[PDB]
Short mmCIF file of all heavy atoms in Angstrom, two decimals:
data_model
loop_
_atom_site.label_atom_id
_atom_site.label_comp_id
_atom_site.label_asym_id
_atom_site.label_seq_id
_atom_site.Cartn_x
_atom_site.Cartn_y
_atom_site.Cartn_z
N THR A 1 -51.82 17.52 -24.20
CA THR A 1 -51.57 17.87 -22.70
C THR A 1 -50.07 18.13 -22.52
O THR A 1 -49.27 18.02 -23.44
CB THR A 1 -51.99 16.74 -21.85
OG1 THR A 1 -51.96 17.15 -20.46
CG2 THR A 1 -50.98 15.49 -21.97
N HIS A 2 -49.73 18.46 -21.29
CA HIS A 2 -48.30 18.69 -20.97
C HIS A 2 -47.95 18.25 -19.63
O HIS A 2 -46.82 18.51 -19.13
CB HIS A 2 -47.90 20.16 -21.13
CG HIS A 2 -48.32 21.05 -20.04
ND1 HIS A 2 -49.64 21.47 -19.90
CD2 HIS A 2 -47.72 21.58 -18.97
CE1 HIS A 2 -49.73 22.21 -18.75
NE2 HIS A 2 -48.58 22.34 -18.30
N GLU A 3 -48.88 17.50 -18.85
CA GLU A 3 -48.60 17.01 -17.55
C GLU A 3 -48.40 15.54 -17.67
O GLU A 3 -49.13 14.83 -18.29
CB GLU A 3 -49.73 17.34 -16.63
CG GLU A 3 -51.14 17.17 -17.23
CD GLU A 3 -52.20 17.55 -16.39
OE1 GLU A 3 -51.95 18.22 -15.35
OE2 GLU A 3 -53.45 17.43 -16.69
N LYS A 4 -47.38 15.04 -16.89
CA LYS A 4 -47.05 13.63 -17.09
C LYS A 4 -46.51 13.05 -15.83
O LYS A 4 -45.39 13.42 -15.28
CB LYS A 4 -46.08 13.42 -18.23
CG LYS A 4 -45.14 14.60 -18.40
CD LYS A 4 -44.45 14.60 -19.79
CE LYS A 4 -43.49 15.84 -19.94
NZ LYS A 4 -42.89 15.77 -21.24
N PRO A 5 -47.19 12.11 -15.16
CA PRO A 5 -46.59 11.29 -14.13
C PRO A 5 -45.74 10.22 -14.75
O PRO A 5 -45.73 10.05 -15.94
CB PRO A 5 -47.77 10.76 -13.30
CG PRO A 5 -48.75 10.65 -14.39
CD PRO A 5 -48.65 11.83 -15.34
N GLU A 6 -45.03 9.45 -13.86
CA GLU A 6 -44.38 8.25 -14.38
C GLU A 6 -45.41 7.16 -14.64
O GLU A 6 -46.52 7.33 -14.21
CB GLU A 6 -43.36 7.77 -13.33
CG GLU A 6 -42.48 8.90 -12.83
CD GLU A 6 -41.22 8.36 -12.15
OE1 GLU A 6 -41.19 7.15 -11.80
OE2 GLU A 6 -40.20 9.15 -12.04
N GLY A 7 -44.97 6.18 -15.43
CA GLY A 7 -45.85 5.10 -15.69
C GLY A 7 -45.51 4.43 -17.02
O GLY A 7 -44.31 4.36 -17.39
N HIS A 8 -46.52 3.97 -17.73
CA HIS A 8 -46.32 3.22 -19.03
C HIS A 8 -47.44 3.66 -19.91
O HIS A 8 -48.54 3.72 -19.65
CB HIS A 8 -46.47 1.73 -18.84
CG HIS A 8 -47.55 1.34 -17.89
ND1 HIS A 8 -48.86 1.55 -18.18
CD2 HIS A 8 -47.56 0.70 -16.67
CE1 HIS A 8 -49.64 1.10 -17.23
NE2 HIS A 8 -48.92 0.56 -16.27
N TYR A 9 -47.03 4.05 -21.18
CA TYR A 9 -47.85 4.54 -22.26
C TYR A 9 -47.87 3.52 -23.46
O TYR A 9 -47.18 2.51 -23.43
CB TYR A 9 -47.47 5.94 -22.68
CG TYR A 9 -47.47 6.94 -21.62
CD1 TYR A 9 -46.49 7.96 -21.70
CD2 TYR A 9 -48.24 6.89 -20.57
CE1 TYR A 9 -46.47 8.93 -20.71
CE2 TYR A 9 -48.17 7.83 -19.52
CZ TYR A 9 -47.23 8.86 -19.55
OH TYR A 9 -47.15 9.80 -18.57
N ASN A 10 -48.57 3.90 -24.50
CA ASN A 10 -48.72 3.06 -25.68
C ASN A 10 -48.63 3.91 -26.98
O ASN A 10 -49.11 5.05 -27.01
CB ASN A 10 -50.01 2.27 -25.65
CG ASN A 10 -51.15 2.98 -25.13
OD1 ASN A 10 -51.05 4.17 -24.92
ND2 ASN A 10 -52.30 2.42 -25.05
N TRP A 11 -48.13 3.29 -27.98
CA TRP A 11 -47.95 3.98 -29.26
C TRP A 11 -48.16 2.99 -30.42
O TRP A 11 -48.46 1.79 -30.24
CB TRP A 11 -46.61 4.74 -29.38
CG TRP A 11 -45.45 3.87 -29.32
CD1 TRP A 11 -44.98 2.98 -28.41
CD2 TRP A 11 -44.42 3.90 -30.35
NE1 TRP A 11 -43.78 2.42 -28.74
CE2 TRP A 11 -43.41 2.95 -29.90
CE3 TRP A 11 -44.16 4.51 -31.56
CZ2 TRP A 11 -42.25 2.68 -30.70
CZ3 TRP A 11 -43.05 4.28 -32.32
CH2 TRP A 11 -42.14 3.32 -31.89
N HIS A 12 -47.74 3.44 -31.67
CA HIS A 12 -48.09 2.65 -32.84
C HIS A 12 -47.34 1.35 -32.93
O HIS A 12 -47.77 0.45 -33.64
CB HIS A 12 -47.94 3.50 -34.09
CG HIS A 12 -48.41 2.93 -35.34
ND1 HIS A 12 -47.70 2.09 -36.16
CD2 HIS A 12 -49.67 3.03 -35.90
CE1 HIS A 12 -48.42 1.70 -37.19
NE2 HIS A 12 -49.66 2.26 -36.99
N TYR A 13 -46.17 1.24 -32.30
CA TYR A 13 -45.42 -0.01 -32.38
C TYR A 13 -45.43 -0.79 -31.04
O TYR A 13 -44.61 -1.69 -30.90
CB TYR A 13 -43.93 0.33 -32.80
CG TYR A 13 -43.79 0.63 -34.28
CD1 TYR A 13 -42.65 1.11 -34.77
CD2 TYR A 13 -44.81 0.57 -35.17
CE1 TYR A 13 -42.41 1.40 -36.10
CE2 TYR A 13 -44.71 0.89 -36.50
CZ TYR A 13 -43.47 1.30 -36.88
OH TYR A 13 -43.32 1.60 -38.25
N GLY A 14 -46.32 -0.42 -30.16
CA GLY A 14 -46.40 -1.27 -28.92
C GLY A 14 -46.52 -0.39 -27.70
O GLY A 14 -47.38 0.48 -27.66
N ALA A 15 -45.81 -0.74 -26.63
CA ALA A 15 -45.81 -0.02 -25.41
C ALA A 15 -44.50 0.75 -25.23
O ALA A 15 -43.53 0.63 -25.92
CB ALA A 15 -45.86 -1.00 -24.27
N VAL A 16 -44.64 1.66 -24.19
CA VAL A 16 -43.48 2.54 -23.87
C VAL A 16 -43.57 2.84 -22.35
O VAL A 16 -44.64 2.86 -21.76
CB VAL A 16 -43.48 3.84 -24.69
CG1 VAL A 16 -44.76 4.61 -24.52
CG2 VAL A 16 -42.32 4.82 -24.32
N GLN A 17 -42.39 2.92 -21.75
CA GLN A 17 -42.29 3.23 -20.29
C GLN A 17 -41.53 4.54 -20.08
O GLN A 17 -40.62 4.88 -20.87
CB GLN A 17 -41.55 2.14 -19.60
CG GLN A 17 -41.26 2.38 -18.15
CD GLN A 17 -40.45 1.28 -17.47
OE1 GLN A 17 -39.31 1.50 -17.00
NE2 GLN A 17 -41.09 0.12 -17.41
N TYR A 18 -41.99 5.32 -19.14
CA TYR A 18 -41.44 6.65 -18.81
C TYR A 18 -40.76 6.53 -17.47
O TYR A 18 -41.42 6.52 -16.51
CB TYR A 18 -42.51 7.74 -18.89
CG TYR A 18 -42.10 9.10 -18.77
CD1 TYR A 18 -42.00 9.97 -19.92
CD2 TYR A 18 -41.80 9.69 -17.62
CE1 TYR A 18 -41.59 11.21 -19.83
CE2 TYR A 18 -41.40 11.03 -17.48
CZ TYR A 18 -41.29 11.82 -18.64
OH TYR A 18 -40.96 13.15 -18.55
N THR A 19 -39.44 6.56 -17.47
CA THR A 19 -38.68 6.74 -16.26
C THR A 19 -37.61 7.72 -16.41
O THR A 19 -36.92 7.76 -17.46
CB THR A 19 -38.05 5.35 -15.81
OG1 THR A 19 -37.34 4.78 -16.92
CG2 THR A 19 -39.12 4.43 -15.31
N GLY A 20 -37.43 8.66 -15.41
CA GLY A 20 -36.56 9.72 -15.51
C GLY A 20 -36.61 10.58 -16.74
O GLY A 20 -35.66 11.16 -17.20
N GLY A 21 -37.80 10.66 -17.37
CA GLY A 21 -37.95 11.32 -18.61
C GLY A 21 -37.75 10.50 -19.83
O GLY A 21 -38.70 10.55 -20.77
N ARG A 22 -36.76 9.72 -19.93
CA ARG A 22 -36.46 9.04 -21.16
C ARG A 22 -37.38 7.83 -21.41
O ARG A 22 -37.88 7.24 -20.49
CB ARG A 22 -34.90 8.58 -21.18
CG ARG A 22 -34.51 7.87 -19.90
CD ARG A 22 -33.10 7.40 -19.99
NE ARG A 22 -32.68 6.57 -18.90
CZ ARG A 22 -31.55 5.78 -18.89
NH1 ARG A 22 -30.75 5.82 -19.92
NH2 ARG A 22 -31.28 5.13 -17.76
N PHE A 23 -37.69 7.60 -22.61
CA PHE A 23 -38.78 6.70 -23.03
C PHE A 23 -38.08 5.37 -23.44
O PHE A 23 -37.64 5.21 -24.55
CB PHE A 23 -39.50 7.20 -24.20
CG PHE A 23 -40.32 8.43 -23.89
CD1 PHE A 23 -39.80 9.68 -23.93
CD2 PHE A 23 -41.65 8.37 -23.51
CE1 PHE A 23 -40.44 10.81 -23.62
CE2 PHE A 23 -42.39 9.43 -23.32
CZ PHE A 23 -41.85 10.73 -23.27
N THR A 24 -38.02 4.43 -22.52
CA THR A 24 -37.49 3.02 -22.75
C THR A 24 -38.57 2.27 -23.27
O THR A 24 -39.62 1.84 -22.59
CB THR A 24 -36.84 2.44 -21.57
OG1 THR A 24 -37.83 2.07 -20.65
CG2 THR A 24 -35.92 3.43 -20.89
#
């Protein structure tokens, strides 16, 4: 996909948060 609201995602090493674009 290429559409993304703000929120929180998940990946192979745990969780990830999307704020202002950058992935903290």
